[PDB]
Amino acid sequence: IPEYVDWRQKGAVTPVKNQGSCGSCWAFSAVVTIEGIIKIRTGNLNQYSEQELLDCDRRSYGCNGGYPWSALQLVAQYGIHYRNTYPYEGVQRYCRSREKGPYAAKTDGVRQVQPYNQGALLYSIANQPVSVVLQAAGKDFQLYRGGIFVGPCGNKVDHAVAAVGYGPNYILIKNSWGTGWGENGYIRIKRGTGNSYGVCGLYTSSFYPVKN
Template sequence: MERHSRIYETIEEKLLRFEIFKDNLFHIDDTNKKAANYWLGLNEFADLTHEEFKNNYLSLKPVNTRRDTVNDSSSSSLSTVEIRSNIPKAVDWRKKGAVTPVKNQGSCGSCWALSTIAAIEGINQIVTGNLTALSEQELIDCDTSYNNGCNGGLMDYAFAYIASTGGLHKEEDYPYIMEEGTCAADAKVVTISGYKDVPANNEQSLLKALANQPLSVAIDASGRDFQFYSGGVFDGHCGTSLDHGVAAVGYGSGEKGLDYVIVKNSWGPKWGEKGFIRMKRNTNKPERMCGLYKMASYPTKSK
């Protein structure tokens, strides 16, 4: 309670939360005895049931068919940046200065907006040399034709909106308020040309794209272990029903030879590995871990 500034209004509520906390702690301890490649830990979500956690923090709204790709000025079939014929063994866009600090969506179901912004911040830095934190709040307030603010959305719709409306504000000029607000869509500073979808369930295509820029990706984060992931290469139980928007910012191999994708989450820097999770990528499922390869896309930007 002290660490995470929890205040419970009644003794009944406190007792209820303590029982939930104990149940979560037992799950963490039990999982850590069994899991070999990742581990769980107590965090700010430890007084929430898993259903409460899912209702508050998972908000992607995928559709049965993806949007047709918006035309852009790039002649490349995969990226604005020239594709290497032999992709590197490892890439970490954090080390290349193309990833802003981890943000926290809070109780607003805006993961789709944070995923979109992370990818645009990345390509903007790669093309211009400037890492600029951009406004998720602008998407929440203004991109309302297909997306639903704090009630979920889809990254491709957001890319299309940004390309058609002339760009985005800086985050400092249009700060995040963790709720839906009034649209103020003027004074754009960062633009994109359009976006492209990575072919579904195709590892080579995803790694080629990721070798050139951060990507928006969708995952199934509904497994209970996601709530308390603390470190390691995640290879635990999860499905492929996409319910959370995140950003892929690199890939590599771990100490045990486990290949992984580095994923930037939007649950703050206290979750996971300072806000990131490494997800195993060599599995026997074409969708890969938690549907990671099912629905990836990225913005394009002219130099």
């Protein structure tokens, strides 16, 4: 369980993206999750469509609300297309999955990490990236243009992102905003403080598919 875990230089995460004026956090976080695992075994890095997840997942409320843990489940159940055969537009619409044709990616299950346990988060993040939530409605996290976020912030979780590494002290997160935020679309939050919930409630509820 290395002292350092970066999947970027591991060839697991692709360039950064933006959800835009679309409250669709959840589908983006997922595509990165599934994505990671998909490349971890096969040795093939891919960019899947979040747009599809939006238009297809009726359980989620597309362009403004969702469950990073429906998306995944969805995929495993059905599947998910490339981000070319289903590029992101930013507006929820009619499911094209079927109309689009044969799927391209399809997992083999979804599991959740025991909330409120850093030790647990890491491990999984060590075996493969994960979808995690937190407080973004933040007025500080909103302004982050590079650094180690300690706060201030709260325990009112409401935005989903992704963890793509950690250090002895900083946890790495991929944001669904442009590369005109944090440190090039990236933000480092601090771990090991005692805060069980985890600063910004980053330890509330996390997840991930399964792959054979």
